[PDB]
Structure 1
Amino acid sequence: GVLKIVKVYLAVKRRIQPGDKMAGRHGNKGVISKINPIEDMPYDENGTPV
């Protein structure tokens, strides 16, 4: 009793934001709490931020 089937695929790009869960290879997981601007991150003698 089925005549036709139409399938539609939608693609969306997800960015990073507070609340997303990140981790590492040594069991150190965590949740992002802030997106700090560049001129507030700590920097070294050469001015490269972290």
Structure 2
Amino acid sequence: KKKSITQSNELSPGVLKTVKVFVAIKKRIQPGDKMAGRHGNKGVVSRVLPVE
């Protein structure tokens, strides 16, 4: 945890500092996505109808 290069890398000379950012986001299915059963059938979700 400290046997790095005092900055965690050789830094590929020329580079002062760098930062990594990690962003996560849930996604729900919507008209346009692509479903397909295991039997070679597929299609594009065309609408979403109310329960009733």
For the aligned pair, the TM-score class normalised by the smaller chain equals 0.7 to 0.9
Aligned CA-pair RMSD: 0.7
Could you say which residue in structure 2 is the equivalent of 1:23? 36
Q: Deviations over 1:1-50 (max 9, x none)?
A: 112210001101111100000001010011000101110xxxxxxxxxxx
What amino acid is aligned across from residue 27 of structure 1 in structure 2? G
Hey, which of these two has a bigger chunk of helix by percent? 1
Larger Rg: 2
Q: Percent identity?
A: 74
Could you say which residue in structure 2 is the equivalent of 1:5? 18
Q: TM-score, normalised by structure 2?
A: 0.70
Question: Where in structure 1 do 4 or more consecutive aligned residues deviate above 3 Å?
Answer: none
Flag structure 1 segments of 5+ consecutive residues without an equivalent: 40-50
1:11-50 maps to which residues of 2 (within 5 A)?
11-39=24-52
Q: TM-score, normalised by structure 1?
A: 0.72
